[PDB]
PDB file of all heavy atoms in Angstrom:
ATOM      1  N   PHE A 595      42.058  -9.484  20.824  1.00  0.00           N
ATOM      2  CA  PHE A 595      42.113  -8.341  19.924  1.00  0.00           C
ATOM      3  C   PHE A 595      41.744  -8.739  18.505  1.00  0.00           C
ATOM      4  O   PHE A 595      41.028  -8.004  17.818  1.00  0.00           O
ATOM      5  CB  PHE A 595      43.496  -7.714  19.953  1.00  0.00           C
ATOM      6  CG  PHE A 595      43.623  -6.523  19.073  1.00  0.00           C
ATOM      7  CD1 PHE A 595      43.221  -5.285  19.511  1.00  0.00           C
ATOM      8  CD2 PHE A 595      44.135  -6.639  17.803  1.00  0.00           C
ATOM      9  CE1 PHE A 595      43.336  -4.188  18.705  1.00  0.00           C
ATOM     10  CE2 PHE A 595      44.249  -5.543  16.995  1.00  0.00           C
ATOM     11  CZ  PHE A 595      43.849  -4.317  17.447  1.00  0.00           C
ATOM     12  N   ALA A 598      37.970  -9.222  18.328  1.00  0.00           N
ATOM     13  CA  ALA A 598      37.281  -7.943  18.319  1.00  0.00           C
ATOM     14  C   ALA A 598      37.426  -7.256  16.974  1.00  0.00           C
ATOM     15  O   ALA A 598      36.495  -6.596  16.507  1.00  0.00           O
ATOM     16  CB  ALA A 598      37.815  -7.053  19.433  1.00  0.00           C
ATOM     17  N   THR A 599      38.581  -7.402  16.330  1.00  0.00           N
ATOM     18  CA  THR A 599      38.770  -6.764  15.033  1.00  0.00           C
ATOM     19  C   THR A 599      37.904  -7.399  13.955  1.00  0.00           C
ATOM     20  O   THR A 599      37.333  -6.692  13.120  1.00  0.00           O
ATOM     21  CB  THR A 599      40.230  -6.819  14.634  1.00  0.00           C
ATOM     22  OG1 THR A 599      41.014  -6.224  15.669  1.00  0.00           O
ATOM     23  CG2 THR A 599      40.439  -6.059  13.357  1.00  0.00           C
ATOM     24  N   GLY A 602      34.416  -6.056  14.559  1.00  0.00           N
ATOM     25  CA  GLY A 602      34.256  -4.682  14.125  1.00  0.00           C
ATOM     26  C   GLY A 602      34.194  -4.552  12.618  1.00  0.00           C
ATOM     27  O   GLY A 602      33.394  -3.784  12.086  1.00  0.00           O
ATOM     28  N   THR A 603      35.042  -5.294  11.911  1.00  0.00           N
ATOM     29  CA  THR A 603      35.005  -5.241  10.458  1.00  0.00           C
ATOM     30  C   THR A 603      33.660  -5.701   9.937  1.00  0.00           C
ATOM     31  O   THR A 603      33.099  -5.095   9.017  1.00  0.00           O
ATOM     32  CB  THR A 603      36.115  -6.098   9.874  1.00  0.00           C
ATOM     33  OG1 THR A 603      37.368  -5.452  10.091  1.00  0.00           O
ATOM     34  CG2 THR A 603      35.912  -6.279   8.402  1.00  0.00           C
ATOM     35  N   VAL A 606      31.148  -2.883  10.438  1.00  0.00           N
ATOM     36  CA  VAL A 606      31.320  -1.790   9.490  1.00  0.00           C
ATOM     37  C   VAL A 606      30.754  -2.179   8.142  1.00  0.00           C
ATOM     38  O   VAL A 606      29.895  -1.484   7.593  1.00  0.00           O
ATOM     39  CB  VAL A 606      32.797  -1.396   9.367  1.00  0.00           C
ATOM     40  CG1 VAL A 606      33.010  -0.666   8.084  1.00  0.00           C
ATOM     41  CG2 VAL A 606      33.193  -0.522  10.513  1.00  0.00           C
TER      42      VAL A 606
HETATM   43  C1  44E I 802      38.622   3.775  10.819  1.00  0.00           C
HETATM   44  C2  44E I 802      39.664   3.726  11.937  1.00  0.00           C
HETATM   45  C3  44E I 802      39.274   2.772  13.062  1.00  0.00           C
HETATM   46  C4  44E I 802      40.341   2.641  14.144  1.00  0.00           C
HETATM   47  C5  44E I 802      39.803   1.923  15.373  1.00  0.00           C
HETATM   48  C6  44E I 802      40.784   0.901  15.931  1.00  0.00           C
HETATM   49  O1  44E I 802      41.939   1.131  15.883  1.00  0.00           O
HETATM   50  O2  44E I 802      40.335  -0.293  16.509  1.00  0.00           O
HETATM   51  C7  44E I 802      40.435  -1.424  15.696  1.00  0.00           C
HETATM   52  C8  44E I 802      39.075  -1.668  15.049  1.00  0.00           C
HETATM   53  C9  44E I 802      38.243  -2.569  15.939  1.00  0.00           C
HETATM   54  O3  44E I 802      38.286  -2.040  17.219  1.00  0.00           O
HETATM   55  P1  44E I 802      38.915  -3.018  18.369  1.00  0.00           P
HETATM   56  O4  44E I 802      39.000  -4.406  17.788  1.00  0.00           O
HETATM   57  O5  44E I 802      38.042  -3.018  19.598  1.00  0.00           O
HETATM   58  O6  44E I 802      40.290  -2.514  18.708  1.00  0.00           O
HETATM   59  O7  44E I 802      39.243  -2.310  13.824  1.00  0.00           O
HETATM   60  C10 44E I 802      38.332  -1.921  12.842  1.00  0.00           C
HETATM   61  O8  44E I 802      37.198  -1.756  13.121  1.00  0.00           O
HETATM   62  C11 44E I 802      38.804  -1.710  11.411  1.00  0.00           C
HETATM   63  C12 44E I 802      37.678  -1.269  10.492  1.00  0.00           C
HETATM   64  C13 44E I 802      37.701  -2.004   9.157  1.00  0.00           C
HETATM   65  C14 44E I 802      37.405  -1.068   7.990  1.00  0.00           C
HETATM   66  C15 44E I 802      37.187  -1.811   6.674  1.00  0.00           C
END
Side-chain angles (χ1 to χ4, degrees):
Chain A
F595 181 83
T599 304
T603 288
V606 159

